[PDB]
Write a protein that binds this ligand. Sequence first.
Ligand SMILES: Nc1ncnc2c1ncn2[C@@H]1O[C@H](COP(=O)(O)OP(=O)(O)O)[C@@H](O)[C@H]1O
Ligand SMILES: Nc1ncnc2c1ncn2[C@@H]1O[C@H](COP(=O)(O)OP(=O)(O)O)[C@@H](O)[C@H]1O
Lengths: 258, 269
Amino acid sequence: SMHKALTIAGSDSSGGAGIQADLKTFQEKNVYGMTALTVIVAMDPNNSWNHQVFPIDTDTIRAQLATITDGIGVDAMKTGMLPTVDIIELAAKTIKEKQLKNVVIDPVMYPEHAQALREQLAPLATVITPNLFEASQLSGMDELKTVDDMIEAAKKIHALGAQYVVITGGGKLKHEKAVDVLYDGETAEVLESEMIDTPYTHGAGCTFSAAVTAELAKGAEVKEAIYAAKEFITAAIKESFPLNQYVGPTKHSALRLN
Amino acid sequence: MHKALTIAGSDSSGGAGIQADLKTFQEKNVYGMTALTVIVAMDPNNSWNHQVFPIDTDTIRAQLATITDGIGVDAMKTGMLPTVDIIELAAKTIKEKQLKNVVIDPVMVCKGANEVLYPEHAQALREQLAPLATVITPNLFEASQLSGMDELKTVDDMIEAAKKIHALGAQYVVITGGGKLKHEKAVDVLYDGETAEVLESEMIDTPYTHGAGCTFSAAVTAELAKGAEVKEAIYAAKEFITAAIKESFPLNQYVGPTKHSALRLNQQS
Ligand SMILES: Nc1ncnc2c1ncn2[C@@H]1O[C@H](COP(=O)(O)OP(=O)(O)O)[C@@H](O)[C@H]1O
Ligand SMILES: Nc1ncnc2c1ncn2[C@@H]1O[C@H](COP(=O)(O)OP(=O)(O)O)[C@@H](O)[C@H]1O
């Protein structure tokens, strides 16, 4: 009695982003989650939280994918941190060959890395969910500063072959509200939620894309799912908190408890 | 949020290890963090054969550093620690960082008949990790390995194993029996220093109990992290997998996990 989702992403030792975010989000929305781990990330506690990154062998990634895609099926799927061009290639190759449905590509950002994302993974996306930095990279334009900027980036990145584009803006956008831009082939919609005044938004992007994936896995319409996911991080950011002086994750259980 | 650490392995099929642990932690509103020790896959064209990919001791150390030094935890469990070095690292971490509410799930590696083919692994579990446990949660196989006795067949066997393994230094022992015990009910044995209690639940007639033991120990851990008494937590955890097994289901022809969301949705919470 469960719908299933795959996340091809990284481990976040601190527990608010990557695999952890993804599994936490999946679980909150009653979707049976499975992970293909691509890197292990740690933050050094005596070195001002310095990211230490431990990449996982391509073969190991293949093995996990084998069992998840060939041996079980998935109703939806997302990519998070794919740290290497080979891994982007493996992910893209898996998606085509296994003909995976409801592909939510979160283009977590080397030149050829950005380019592989653009040239191999983007065209395969049902939904693609860049933030302002990621959006301007994929579209090849300058720093996005206005809601108009986001809109022409959305069109530009949609032109790569992604079905739907969500450009995430929120806290990093100068604006009265927390705004994202949703674009089908046709028209741009501006999604709005309350701005939460908080620096505690670690793993928000991973949680948003996770929340889209989960919703897509349960059979929702793409736009329906994106709205639902917008509802989810808003609640999860509103109840966000600090872990230590470097990092404050979102509260995935927030929608459920309120 | 209350916080819990799991020092355990990744299950690609999503019902056991890290996945079970996180899923359980989340259901019970405990902020989960993982120190990954192995990646395990199952070969789809080779009858679901376990492919195991161990993680470098240094990488494990680094994850532990950030979890234990950089954030704290309210409780903690160990799952699959595939290597003596990894048992030693886990034990060393527990001591040095003075971790509280230590739930040790003594997952054994090289199973065979009723013996472990990696003797010193089992021994390190016995001599180094067991004494550190607030709760230790062996199943029938694991229990007889720790206690040095023969295959457990009866509730009496479980009781003397519990006494034997409590003698290692674990504060509380739960011997898990459930589906693998010939019995009318799904029974586990809880033992403090003093008296043995027989925990009972409905037996669910189902082969879909993959990751049950991981889920049980995660549930204890989560409940401990929220401030519960040890026995209180064990009862709550007993309630949790009962529900999760009752609503269990198949993924394919080889494996059926428990439904972690069951208690939330499938019995009055
Ligand atoms: N302060 C905030 N208040 C409310 N919502 C926010 C806030 N910051 C970000 N969001 C929302 O959370 C989601 C995460 O997007 P974003 O932060 O751009 O990605 P990332 O977290 O990877 O940087 C977006 O839907 C965004 O609108
Ligand atoms: N068929 C079943 N019906 C009800 N409870 C069960 C069943 N099988 C196992 N359990 C319970 O699930 C929990 C997991 O224990 P066990 O299956 O022994 O661990 P493991 O998964 O490590 O083998 C225990 O509390 C046990 O009593």
